[PDB]
């Protein structure tokens, strides 16, 4: 089972913020909750996470520190699930966020966007 205010799907617990923070501060917040910024491993996981998104741009655990996209937990990016908006990312420090429709885009990591934490059960 998951902590109160988190939602369960398969082997993960998810928490959706109601306020915004820079990408790195969001990652620190999730780490302190024994979690990480969400890593989208599959279409099924994408579909679950996206229905809880609000209208705010929302960080995921994907960033481009040295001209290579990397998931925060070391999940392989190039062979992994991707759900970019068409033509995106077009400017690749850069961090990935969800649009309200669940598709991904990039912006600078300082923006105070909402975020999602993901933890084990
Ligand atoms: Ca995941």
Instruction: Please give the residue range of the domain that contains residue 72.
Output: 1-121
Known binding residues for Ca(2+): 39, 41, 45, 64, 90-91, 93-94, 105-106, 118
The token duo for 44 is 């099924």
The token duo for 23 is 């990408």
Q: Find the 91 Cα to ligand 1 centroid distance in Å.
A: 25
The token duo for 97 is 């966020």
As a whole number of angstroms, the distance between CA 52 and CA 22 comes to 20
DSSP letter for 108, please. E
Rg value, the chain, Cα = 13
For 2, the 3-state DSSP assignment is coil
As a whole number of angstroms, the distance between CA 62 and CA 104 comes to 10
Q: Are 39 and 72 a contacting pair, CB within 8 Å?
A: yes
Q: Find the 17 Cα to ligand 1 centroid distance in Å.
A: 17
Chain-centroid distance of CA 73 in Å reads 11
> Where does 33-70 have alpha helices with state H?
43-51
As a whole number of angstroms, the distance between CA 28 and CA 32 comes to 6
> Resolution in angstroms, to 1 decimal, for this deposition?
1.2
Distance linking the first and last C-alpha atoms of the chain: 6
Known binding residues for a glycoprotein: 88, 90, 93, 99, 105
Question: Which regions of the chain does DSSP assign to beta strands (E)?
Answer: 7-9, 12-16, 36-37, 58-63, 70-71, 94-98, 104-108, 114-120
Number of structural domains in the chain: 1
Method used for this model? X-ray
């Amino acid at each position: 089972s998951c902590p109160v205010n988190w939602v369960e799907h398969q082997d993960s617990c998810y928490w959706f913020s109601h306020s915004g923070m820079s990408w790195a501060e969001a990652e620190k917040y999730c780490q302190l909750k024994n979690a990480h910024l969400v890593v989208i491993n599959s279409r099924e996981e994408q579909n679950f996470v996206q229905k809880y998104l609000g209208s705010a741009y929302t960080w995921m655990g994907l960033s481009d520190p040295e001209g290579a996209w990397k998931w925060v937990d070391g999940t392989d990016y190039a062979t992994g699930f991707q759900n970019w908006k068409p033509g995106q990312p077009d400017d690749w420090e850069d961090c990935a966020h969800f649009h309200p429709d669940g598709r991904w885009n990039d912006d600078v990591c300082q923006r105070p966007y909402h975020w999602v934490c993901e933890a084990g059960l």
